[PDB]
Amino acid sequence: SPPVVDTAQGRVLGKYVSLEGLAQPVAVFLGVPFAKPPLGSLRFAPPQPAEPWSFVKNTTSYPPMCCQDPVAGQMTSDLFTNRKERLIPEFSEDCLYLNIYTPADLTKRGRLPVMVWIHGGGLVVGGASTYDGLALAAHENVVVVAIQYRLGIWGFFSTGDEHSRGNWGHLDQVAALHWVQENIANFGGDPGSVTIFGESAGGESVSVLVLSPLAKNLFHRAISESGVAFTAGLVRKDMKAAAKQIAVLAGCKTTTSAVFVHCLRQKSEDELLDLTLKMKFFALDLHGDPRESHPFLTTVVDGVLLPKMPEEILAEKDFNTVPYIVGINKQEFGWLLPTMMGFPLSEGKLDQKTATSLLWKSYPIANIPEELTPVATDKYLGGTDDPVKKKDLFLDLMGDVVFGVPSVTVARQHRDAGAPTYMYEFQYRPSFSSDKKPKTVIGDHGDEIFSVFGAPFLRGDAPEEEVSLSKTVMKFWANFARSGNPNGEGLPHWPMYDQEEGYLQIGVNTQAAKRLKGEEVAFWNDLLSK
């Protein structure tokens, strides 16, 4: 007896889906529009509300993902998905949709916590339909909403002025959150209790929404998994140089910003896609000048989403000071990222000259000047002659500079603004890992996702240790959605990230520790001191 729910713009039809092991049926709505399709002159512009529809809109099939490299998009979906049935996504400029998983009794007026998932993919790839909210919803009695937002050129093209400010993907995230306020009560969600959560560039997005005056009162808890505002230089003052490259590739005059943006608006989707492949996003440039490489189009300081740089918003303490879990994995640069970015590290072996050279080429994500680059690799690799250990230590280096240090730096300033703050370090190797990934890589980028989204209940043949870790993580995450505090009956103690900097080591042996990356932060700030 399929569920039909009212929204401000019209009625939607979903499907009931059962999870093997639980009695609880979950109502699933796929491809709910939250904005007008950003086509034509709506490209490189703020999202507009969806036009209303008559009759009942069928929301039972996965929507398209936003345009992106389709080969890298398919690979990202494969690597990150938590369900059995492999998704073959479609791609389109018409992509401002969300998917909803609600376990609420829709005949009642439910008031479940709402968890809004913001996917990662470096702001250039990814989509919502990769992430099945079924297990998290059914096990923890929360409404899971997975949203989409414009990516790449479509999402982030900026002229650095009023003609194309930038941040279109973040304005879409904001529009989705307004949609949740207006409409989630009809899906049994409590709009007074919305947790935003995301991983990698989705974590950066959560962090940016925490800082943004546009997102005020649109959520009440935050979780950044493996990404905050300082991560990978994904937030910059401007985009002048990358914009120039786009103009040369597109054949657009840059006489003025208006003329430039108007030329890009006339391009077809195929032309912008081809321009996307030519920018070579999400890839280490091995041959060109590292100062001129732009593997991501970034969040920018536009004066609307962000009035100023994140450092200055954090230091001034006026932002969305909600309860905030900020976490990282043990080995953020262990395998997935170097492989996906094309780091020449298949060898199993690395010497210190080459580590220094690769750190310099990583300038776009690491931001370490050429002359300080041997000092960094000496610090991390100089205590051993063993090249197998040097490789493993270089990957610790990259993890720390790109993820660990940024995450701790942000948690500290969030705590110092007076907000409840929690940190974790996740250390587990999922059975769902790729065949290509070595057995020795534990807590790789993305590994927590399988626990958070209940992959053991949806796919594979997970052993009891892994099943149990997923229940623990989901329960912490949903307790936090409920109360702003992840703690509860039968879960290990997770201390607050206060002046003593307590954090939770999550893994086979889940337990509290202190002072996450304390020394590494000290070193990296001192190296870039100037």
From TrEMBL:
Question: What is a GO molecular function of this protein?
Answer: hydrolase activity
- Top enzyme class, one word, equals hydrolase
Entry keyword Disulfide bond? yes
Is-annotated flag, keyword Disulfide bond?
yes
Instruction: Print the keywords alphabetically.
Output: Disulfide bond, Hydrolase
Similarity comment text for this entry: Belongs to the type-B carboxylesterase/lipase family.
Protein name in the entry: Carboxylic ester hydrolase
According to its UniProt entry, this protein's organism is Sus scrofa (Pig)
Q: Which gene encodes it?
A: APLE
